Write a protein that binds this ligand. Structure first.
Ligand SMILES: NC(=O)C1=CN([C@@H]2O[C@H](COP(=O)(O)OP(=O)(O)OC[C@H]3O[C@@H](n4cnc5c(N)ncnc54)[C@H](OP(=O)(O)O)[C@@H]3O)[C@@H](O)[C@H]2O)C=CC1
Ligand SMILES: NC(=O)C1=CN([C@@H]2O[C@H](COP(=O)(O)OP(=O)(O)OC[C@H]3O[C@@H](n4cnc5c(N)ncnc54)[C@H](OP(=O)(O)O)[C@@H]3O)[C@@H](O)[C@H]2O)C=CC1
Ligand SMILES: CC(C)c1onc(-c2c(Cl)cccc2Cl)c1C(=O)c1cn(C)c2c(/C=C/C(=O)O)cccc12
Ligand SMILES: CC(C)c1onc(-c2c(Cl)cccc2Cl)c1C(=O)c1cn(C)c2c(/C=C/C(=O)O)cccc12
Lengths: 400, 400
C-alpha cells in the first residue's frame, strides 16, 4: 500500500513536456502516491475544443484545492493557429491562471555539485521573486498633466507630464495599489521563512523616488510589524538594495537568499546558458495557502519535432519533476502529512543524486563540457534518464 | 609619417578610466594618427570649477565636428558631493550631452573567440538600440486622472487612470514625442545600413496598443517611405516583433542584426563579468554625428586600489573601441582609407591579443571562474596596454 496524497490539481500540456509529464506520472508518482486527482487537459486541441473553458476550470480548481501542478502549454500565435486550425488565438493559459489566482512568481535553479552555475562561486540556492495602464495618442501640441483628487474633496494635485511643443506623441498613466505591494511583500517574507534564507528587495528607488520608495517603505513596515520576530528566530534578515548594489552583492555572494525585484528575463539568461531544464517556478498566492508549481521552460517544441520524426531526444525532466515535488511538499504542509513530505523530499534527492553520480541529459552534459565536446556517451536519452530516476527512486524508498 | 585623422572631439573623464584614456592616447593613437583635436576635460573637478560649462561646450563641439569620443565620467551623488566638496550635484554629463545631440545609444559587445557569449549559437555581433516620468504617492482613496489640453484650444481630454476606492498606492505618467520616435527610427535605419544588417524593433503593442503602437506605426511609415529601397539594395530588411517573439527569435539566431527596443543589459553584462567588453555609441538621426564611449563606469574600485599604489587589472577594450568606433566614423565621413584601416587594425589587434591568451583579470574570470583565477593567468592594466602597443606596432608594420 502507498501514500495518501490528498487533493491535487494537475494540468496536462503540450508537445515534449506532455510526454515527459506522463512518464513522470507513470514512473515517479503513481507507484507511490494515490491522489484525489483533479486533472484538466490543457493540451491545445482540448482548449480549442472547449473554447478555452478547461483553462478557466483548472484555475478555479486551484483556488478551491490550494495545490496546482502544471505541464508547459503552447501559447498560440499566428503560426499555431494555422498549425492547429484554431478557432481563435487563445490567451496564454499562464496569463489566465495568474490573472485568476494572483500572487507572486518565484524562480529557482535546481543545483547539482557537478553542474556549473551561471556565476562560478554560487554554492547555495537563489530564489527570484517578481512582482493595467491607460495609454493614448497625443495628436498634436498641448499639455499632458496627471491629477489626483482625494475622495474627501480636500485637495487637488496636478503634475505636468509634458508640454508637447514640436508635435504630438503618446502618453500613459500607470498605478499600483498598496494592497498589491503588500501581497508581494507577504509572499516574499513567507518564502524567505519557508526556505530559511534572508530576503533582499531590489528597486531603482533613486530614479522613481516615489513609486519604488513605496515598495521600500511597505516592505520595511510589514517586516517590522510581522516578521522581524520570526526572522531572528531562523537567524535570517531582510534588507533593501539598489539594483546596482544587488547585482554586485550577488556576484560576490555564496547564494542562499530570496531576491524580490520590482519588474522579467530570468528565463532568457538560463536559456542562453543552457540550464533552463533545471529552472523551476512556483506562484505563491498572497493567502499563504494556494500555490501553482511548474517548470520555467515551455513545451520544448524543437525536441518534440525530433520525437515525431523518430529521432532520439534528450529532454531534461528536472524542472517538471520539481513542479510535482514542490506541489506535493506544499500539499503535505497543508495536510500535516509526514509521509507525503517524506516522499517529495525523497524524489528531489533522487533527482539531484542521479545527476551528481554522472547520469544526465544532453543539456546538462553540454553545460559541463560545451556542446561541441559532447559525446553521445556523455548523456542519457529522455527515456533512459527517466528509467534511471525510476530505479534510484525504488531503491531509495525501499529503506527507512 | 602619421595618418592625418582630421577633426575629433575628445572628452577626458574620471578615476580609473581617466588613467586608461591617457595610456590609449599616448600608446595607441598619437604614435600613428595626428588629429585636429578638440579636447574637453570632463573630469569632475573641472566640471565643478567651470560650473559644468565644459560639458556644454563639449556637446556643442560634437554638434559642430560630428565625431566625439568620451571617457567615463562620475555622475555626482550625495556621497560624491561630499567627496569632492562640489558646488552642486551636477547633472550627468551623458544626460547633458544626449539632450543637446539627441540620437540613440547603440550598445555592442566586443566578441573574442575564447570568451563565452550569452548564447552559444551567436556567431556574429548583436547591436542593441535602447530608446523621465512623473511619479507620486497616492496617500489614500480618490481618483487619478490624466489629461491632454491641445494647445489650439480645442476641448480638454480626460482619461481615468484609476479610482482608488480603499487605500493608497502609487501612480505615474510617462510620455514620448513623435519627434523622438522618428529619431529612434532614423538612427536605427541608419545603423543597420552602416553595419549592413537586418533591423528588428520589439514592442509590447498588444498590451500598450496606442503607446507601443505609435512606435510600430512610425517605424513602418518611415521604412516604407524612405528606407526600404536602400534596404533591399544591401539585401537586408526591417521587421517588427512582439518582445516575446523577438526574444525567442534571438535565442535561435546566429546574430548579425540591429535590435531597436523600448537597464537589464548592464545587469546581464555586469552579472556575467564582461562590462569591459561593452561599447556604446550615440547615433544621431542625421547619420553624421556620433559619440562613442565605454558602456561601463569609471571603475572606482580599481581606482581606489591604484591610489594605494597596488596593482590593478582594468579592461581597456571598451575604451579602446570608443576610439576605434569614433575614428571609423570619422574615416567614413571624410573617405579616409588610411584611418579606416588603422581603426580596424586597432580593433583586430585588441581582439587577437585577448584571443592569444593575454587578457585582464575580468576576462580570465569569464574563462575560468573568478575563484579559479591566478596571477599568471592575466596581465595588469599597464602590462596589457604595453602588450597591445607592441602587437599594434608589429601589425601595422606587416600591413606595409
Ligand atoms: N509556462 C509555459 O506553459 C510556457 C510555455 N511556452 C511555450 O512552449 C513552446 C516552446 O517555446 P520555446 O520558445 O521553444 O521555448 P522552450 O523553453 O520550450 O525551449 C527553448 C529551448 O530551451 C532549451 N530547453 C528548454 N527546456 C528544456 C528541457 N526540459 N530540456 C532540454 N532543453 C530544454 C532547448 O534548447 P535547445 O534547442 O538548444 O535544445 C529548447 O529548444 C511555445 O509554444 C511556447 O508558447 C514557453 C514558455 C513557458
Ligand atoms: N559612461 C559613463 O560616464 C558612466 C559613468 N558611470 C560612473 O562611474 C562611477 C563608478 O560606477 P560603478 O558602479 O563602479 O560602475 P563601473 O561600471 O565603473 O564598475 C562596476 C564594476 O564592473 C566591473 N568593470 C567595469 N568596467 C571594468 C573594466 N574596464 N575592467 C574591469 N572590470 C570592469 C568591475 O567589477 P569588479 O569590481 O568586480 O572588478 C567594476 O567595479 C560612478 O560614479 C558612475 O556615475 C557609470 C556608468 C556609465
Ligand atoms: C533587454 C532586451 C533587449 C533583452 O531581451 N532578451 C535579452 C537576452 C537574450 Cl536575447 C539572451 C540572453 C539574455 C537576455 Cl536578457 C535581452 C538583453 O538584455 C540582451 C540581448 N543581447 C543580445 C545582449 C547582450 C549581447 C551579448 C553578445 O552579443 O554576446 C549583452 C547584454 C544584454 C543583452
Ligand atoms: C534581473 C535581475 C533579477 C538580475 O540581475 N542580475 C542578474 C544576473 C546575475 Cl546576479 C548574474 C549573472 C547574470 C545575471 Cl543576468 C539577474 C538575473 O537575471 C539572474 C539572477 N540569478 C541569480 C539568475 C539565475 C540563477 C542561477 C542559479 O541559481 O544557478 C538564472 C537566470 C537568471 C538570473
Amino acid at each position: 500500500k502507498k501514500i495518501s496524497g490528498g487533493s491535487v490539481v494537475e494540468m496536462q500540456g503540450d508537445e515534449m513536456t506532455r510526454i515527459i509529464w506522463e512518464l513522470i506520472k507513470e514512473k515517479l508518482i503513481f507507484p507511490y502516491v494515490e491522489l484525489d486527482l483533479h486533472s484538466y487537459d490543457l493540451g491545445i486541441e482540448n482548449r480549442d475544443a472547449t473554447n478555452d473553458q478547461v483553462t478557466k476550470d483548472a484555475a478555479e480548481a486551484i483556488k478551491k484545492h490550494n495545490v496546482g501542478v502544471k505541464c508547459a502549454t503552447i501559447t498560440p500565435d499566428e503560426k499555431r493557429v494555422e498549425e492547429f486550425k484554431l478557432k481563435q488565438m487563445w490567451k496564454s493559459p499562464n496569463g489566465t491562471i495568474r490573472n485568476i489566482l494572483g500572487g507572486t512568481v518565484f524562480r529557482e535553479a535546481i543545483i547539482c555539485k557537478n553542474i556549473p552555475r551561471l556565476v562560478s562561486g554560487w554554492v547555495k540556492p537563489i530564489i527570484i521573486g517578481c512582482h493595467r495602464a491607460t495609454d493614448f495618442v497625443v495628436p498634436g501640441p498641448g499639455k499632458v498633466e496627471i491629477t489626483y483628487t482625494p475622495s474627501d474633496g480636500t485637495q487637488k494635485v496636478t503634475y505636468l507630464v509634458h508640454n508637447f511643443e514640436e508635435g504630438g506623441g503618446v502618453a500613459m498613466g500607470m498605478y499600483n495599489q498598496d494592497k498589491s505591494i503588500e501581497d508581494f511583500a507577504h509572499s516574499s517574507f513567507q518564502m524567505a521563512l519557508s526556505k530559511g534564507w534572508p530576503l533582499y528587495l531590489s528597486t531603482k528607488n533613486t530614479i522613481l523616488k516615489k513609486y519604488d520608495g513605496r515598495f521600500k517603505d511597505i516592505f520595511q513596515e510589514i517586516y517590522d510589524k510581522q516578521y522581524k520576530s520570526q526572522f531572528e528566530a531562523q537567524k535570517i534578515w531582510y534588507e533593501h538594495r539598489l539594483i546596482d548594489d544587488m547585482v554586485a552583492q550577488a556576484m560576490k555572494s555564496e547564494g542562499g537568499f530570496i531576491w524580490a525585484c520590482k519588474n522579467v528575463q530570468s528565463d532568457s539568461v538560463a536559456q542562453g546558458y543552457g540550464s533552463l531544464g533545471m529552472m523551476t517556478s512556483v506562484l505563491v498566492c498572497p493567502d499563504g495557502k494556494t500555490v501553482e508549481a511548474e517548470a520555467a521552460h515551455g513545451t520544448v517544441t524543437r525536441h518534440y519535432r525530433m520525437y515525431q520524426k523518430g529521432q532520439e531526444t534528450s529532454t531534461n525532466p528536472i524542472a517538471s519533476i520539481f513542479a510535482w515535488t514542490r506541489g506535493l511538499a506544499h500539499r503535505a504542509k497543508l495536510d500535516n502529512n509526514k509521509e507525503l513530505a517524506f516522499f517529495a523530499n525523497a524524489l528531489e534527492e533522487v533527482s539531484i543524486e542521479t545527476i551528481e553520480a554522472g547520469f544526465m541529459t544532453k543539456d546538462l552534459a553540454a553545460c559541463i563540457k560545451g556542446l561541441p565536446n559532447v559525446q553521445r556517451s556523455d548523456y542519457l536519452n529522455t527515456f533512459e534518464f527517466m528509467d534511471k530516476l525510476g530505479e534510484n527512486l525504488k531503491i531509495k524508498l525501499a529503506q527507512a
